[PDB]
Amino acid sequence: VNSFSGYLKLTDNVYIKNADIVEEAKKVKPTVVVNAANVYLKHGGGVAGALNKATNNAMQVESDDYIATNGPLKVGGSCVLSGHNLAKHCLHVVGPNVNKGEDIQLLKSAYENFNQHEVLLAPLLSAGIFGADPIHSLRVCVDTVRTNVYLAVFDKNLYDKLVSSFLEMKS
């Protein structure tokens, strides 16, 4: 497991690839895929829906059951559930929905959950439906995470922008 290939090494522990996270997960068989979740684990568009659909909706049913007996998550919080056919585990992480005025500082809280895991396959938290700048999310990630994080960015134009921006700001 955890056979990541073709990543660009950004820091000693952060790696980035222009790849759909679902197909990376099928290729790599990671111990942990990260899901960019909301506090009720209602997997809408974005990564959550793609992950859910690849589990034939088993992730959404598992999430319903988790929520029924544990209640919703906190922004910046997380929960480990099954990774189903994609990974051993899925780490569901709630970044701030910046479009709704939730504290963007909670992005640091969200990425801090990655530190509980040796190696993760992850998307950029809050950078899509939740409206954070993807460059800011990559920055928080490289600043906050100390464990090995392999970031999947499916859109080639965004990936190119992220690498360029990371170079310039790394100085």
Ligand SMILES: Nc1ncnc2c1nc(Br)n2[C@@H]1O[C@H](COP(=O)(O)OP(=O)(O)OC[C@H]2O[C@@H](O)[C@H](O)[C@@H]2O)[C@@H](O)[C@H]1O
């Ligand atoms: N197949 C893919 N492989 C790789 N990267 C992907 C893929 N698809 C997308 Br899209 N991305 C990119 O991963 C980033 C995060 O976007 P996101 O919307 O999934 O996560 P949040 O902004 O935290 O919103 C959470 C809310 O969205 C609902 O899904 C969830 O239930 C919740 O209510 C963005 O850069 C986006 O371009």
